[PDB]
């Protein structure tokens, strides 16, 4: 049983860190994506 545990176990210490990393990366991506949509807006100011 001790040997089988090594193959399949949650390893919470690394999993919570990976989840936090993924959440931070997702929030950063959403922020920079919302910031990215405003790039073609300057053409309107270019027109008039």
């Amino acid at each position: 049983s001790e040997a089988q545990s090594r193959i399949q176990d949650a390893d919470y210490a690394t999993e919570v860190s990976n989840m936090s990393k993924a959440q931070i990366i997702q929030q950063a991506g959403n922020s920079v994506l919302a910031k990215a949509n405003q790039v073609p807006q300057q053409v309107l100011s270019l027109l008039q």
Partner: protein, 49 residues
């Protein structure tokens, strides 16, 4: 700016977020579950052993 019809600077961000979503899902489901294999999507050698 110079182009309106295509905005690749947003497509790359969308692709990055999509790639991150896989790791997010895997981590969250492995956290909720007690196991690590999660239906043999990983290396099947571990599941068989």
């Amino acid at each position: 700016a110079q182009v309106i019809n295509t905005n690749s600077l947003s497509l790359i961000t969308q692709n990055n977020i999509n790639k991150n979503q896989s790791a997010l899902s895997s981590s969250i489901e492995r956290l909720s579950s007690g196991l690590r294999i999660n239906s043999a999507k990983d290396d099947a050698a571990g599941q068989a052993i």
